[PDB]
A paper describes a structure:
In [name], the ssuABC and [name] gene products encode for an [name] transporter for the uptake of alkanesulfonates and taurine, respectively; [name] is the SBP that recognizes and binds taurine, TauBC is the [name] transporter that mediates the transport of taurine in an ATP-dependent manner. The SsuA and [name] proteins belong to the class II SBPs that are characterized by two globular domains, linked by a flexible linker, that form a cleft where the substrate binds. [name] is composed of two α/β-domains (domain I (23–104 and 202–319) and domain II (105–201)) connected by two-loop hinge regions (103–106 and 200–202) with the substrate-binding site located at the interface of the two domains; both domains are composed of five β-strands flanked by 11 and 4 α-helices, respectively. Although, SBPs are usually described as highly specific for their substrate, we show that [name] is capable of binding different taurine analogues and alkanesulfonates, including phosphonate analogues, with different affinities.
2-Aminoethylphosphonic acid (2-AEP) was selected as a structural analogue since it contains a phosphonate group instead of sulfonate. Although, 2-AEP has the same structural configuration as taurine, very weak binding could be measured, Kd of 649 µM, between [name] and 2-AEP. Despite the very low binding affinity between [name] and 2-AEP by ITC, a complex could be formed under crystallisation conditions. The 2-AEP is co-ordinated in a similar manner as taurine with an additional hydrogen bond between the phosphonate group and the side chain of Ser109. This hydrogen bond is absent from the taurine complex and it is a result of the different rotamer that Ser109 adopts in the presence of 2-AEP in order to co-ordinate the smaller phosphonate anion. SBPs have to undergo large conformational changes between the apo and substrate-bound states driven by ligand binding and in the case of 2-AEP, it is likely that 2-AEP binding that is also coupled to local conformational changes at the binding site, Ser109, is unfavourable, thus allowing the [name] to distinguish over smaller ligands. The crystal structure of [name] with 2-AEP suggests that although the phosphonate group has the same tetrahedral coordination as sulfonate, it cannot be effectively co-ordinated in the binding site and that the ethylamine group alone is not sufficient to co-ordinate tight binding of 2-AEP to taurine. The internuclear distance for the sulfate and phosphate anions has been determined to be 0.38 nm for S-O and 0.36 nm for P-O suggesting that the smaller 2-AEP phosphonate ionic radius results in weaker interactions with the binding site of [name]. Despite the high structural similarity between taurine and 2-AEP, the later also displaces 10 water molecules.
Residue numbers in the entry: 22 to 319
């Protein structure tokens, strides 16, 4: 009897179909407690305490966790982030220079915190010129509704909630093109991987299998109504928003998973940590994070 707690986040992406179908529990035989978390930083804390054994992290919280020597490994990429993550602002903010003096919310050290800082640097705006405030996405939505912030760099469901009456100023496809790409990954605690390697393998299988039909033909995948409804439910977004969100990232074949986990993810962590250090968010970083990545479960 295996019990495993999986920390998940709200991105609308094809592997949510396997989550809704309970495929991981069915194939692994484990009792799975799927726990929704509002951002990666809170997942890092739950991984470090042992309350969570498998967790979905943005690349920015991943780099923070690895720089603190949390005993976790990336064993699977979830997505390469594009415009599914975006900076949405009040409609009177028309140009990046209009961000000066404004109150912009991001969840602390999320991929969108990282991308906001990378976007400001690319634009030549110092982060001290913007009032950057840290709120979790439910609080961001509530503060936006009451007019207490001028914008936020967010993912679903906050990104589409804000965009209904706001404007997109930049997004993570653009910030990636400017040289600061972000990723979503799955990580596992070493002690869990040591005791239940076949359960970890079954998690990776369930996620990879769910994404391949989308990769093969996005438009055919998106017209299967149960694919849309399952993502709408788990992400908390209207069905009409799901296709745009799903198309806002790219996903990996099994060959691409093995390729990325054998070098590129390490390099991504190295660079992400270095930028976070330069922005004053992490005190110490390493020049190699190979301890934090593995291909052995795919």
């Amino acid at each position: 009897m295996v019990n495993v707690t999986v920390a998940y986040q709200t991105s609308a992406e094809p592997a949510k179909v396997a989550q809704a179908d309970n495929t991981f529990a069915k194939e692994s035989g484990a009792t799975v407690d799927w726990r929704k978390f509002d951002s990666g930083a809170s997942i890092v804390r739950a991984l470090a305490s042992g309350d969570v054994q498998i967790g979905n992290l943005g690349s920015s919280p991943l780099a923070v966790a690895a720089s603190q020597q949390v005993p976790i490994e990336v064993f699977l990429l979830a997505s390469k982030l594009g415009n599914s993550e975006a900076l949405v602002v009040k409609k009177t903010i028309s140009k990046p220079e209009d961000l000066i003096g404004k109150r912009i919310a991001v969840p602390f050290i999320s991929t969108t915190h990282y991308s906001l800082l990378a976007a400001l640097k690319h634009w030549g705006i110092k982060p001290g010129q913007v009032e950057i405030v840290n709120l979790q996405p439910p609080a961001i939505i509530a503060a936006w509704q009451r007019g207490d912030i001028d914008g936020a760099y967010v993912w679903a469901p906050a990104v589409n909630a804000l965009e209904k009456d706001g404007k997109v100023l930049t997004d993570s496809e653009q910030v990636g093109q400017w040289g600061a790409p972000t990723l979503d990954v799955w990580v596992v605690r070493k002690d869990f991987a040591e005791k239940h390697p076949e359960v970890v393998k079954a998690f990776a299988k369930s996620a990879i299998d769910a994404q391949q039909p989308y990769i093969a033909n996005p438009d055919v995948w998106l017209k299967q109504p149960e694919n849309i409804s399952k993502l709408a439910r788990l992400s908390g977004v209207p069905e009409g928003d799901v296709p745009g969100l799903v198309k806002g990232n790219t996903y990996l074949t099994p060959q691409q998973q093995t390729a990325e986990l054998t070098g590129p993810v390490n390099k991504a962590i190295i660079d992400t940590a270095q930028f976070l250090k330069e922005q004053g968010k992490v005190p110490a970083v390493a020049n190699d994070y190979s301890q934090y990545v593995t291909s052995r479960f795919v």
